[PDB]
Amino acid sequence: ARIHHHHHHIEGRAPTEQSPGVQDCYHGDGQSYRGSFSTTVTGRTCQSWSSMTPHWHQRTTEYYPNGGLTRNYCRNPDAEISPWCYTMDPNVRWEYCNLTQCPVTESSVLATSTAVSEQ
Numbered sequence: 001a002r003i004h005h006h007h008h009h010i011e012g013r014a015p016t017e018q019s020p021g022v023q024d025c026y027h028g029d030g031q032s033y034r035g036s037f038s039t040t041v042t043g044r045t046c047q048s049w050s051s052m053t054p055h056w057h058q059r060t061t062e063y064y065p066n067g068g069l070t071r072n073y074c075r076n077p078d079a080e081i082s083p084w085c086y087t088m089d090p091n092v093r094w095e096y097c098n099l100t101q102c103p104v105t106e107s108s109v110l111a112t113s114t115a116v117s118e119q
Contacts (some may be wrong), residue, residue, distance in 0.1 A: 008105065009076075009116070011083050011100075021043075022037065022039060022043060022098050023093035023098055023100070024037050024097065024098045024099055024100070025099060025100045025101065025102035025103070025104075026076075026082050026083065026099035026100065026101065026102060027101075027102050027108075029079045029080060029082065030074060030075065030076025030079070030080060030083035030084075030099055031079050032082050033074075033075055033076065033099065034068070034111075036069075036071075036072075036073035036074065037073075037074050037097050038073055038074045038085065038100070039071045039074065039098055040074070040084075040087050040095040040096070040099070040106050041058070041084070041095050041096045041097060042087075042091065042092060042095055042097050043098075044087035044089055044092050044095065045072060045087060045088045045089075046072045046073060046085030046086065046087070046088075046097065047072060047085065047086035047087050047088040048062070048071050048072040048073035048086075049061045049062045049069070049070065049071070049072075049086070050062035050070075050071070051072075051086060051088070054086070054087075054088070054089070054090040054118060055086050055093050055094065057086070057089070061075065061077055064077075068086075069083070072085070072088070073085075074097040076099075079080065080102070081096075081099065082096050082100070083095060083096070083097055083099055084096040084097035085097065092096055
């Protein structure tokens, strides 16, 4: 019925795609993600945490809803700089997803106690 192109991956320039491609973001340390961005920094896909086929590992988030990242959703169960997850590819054990400190301009921050400038 429908299938994404299966020929080239960087249909843009010869060497590399000039414009920016995938570039998600996160608030805090991947803790405020609240999104199932199953995309790894390499463009891979967050393999289901409960995936015992390729890379096997105990203590999954599928058995721990306290995280909110079940299935192939990418999240940060360690509160590290950002969320990460196993990849559906056996060539990539695991990796961080394309997250970054959401550098937005809108207000977003609902707190106005102290103000920080140039910091």
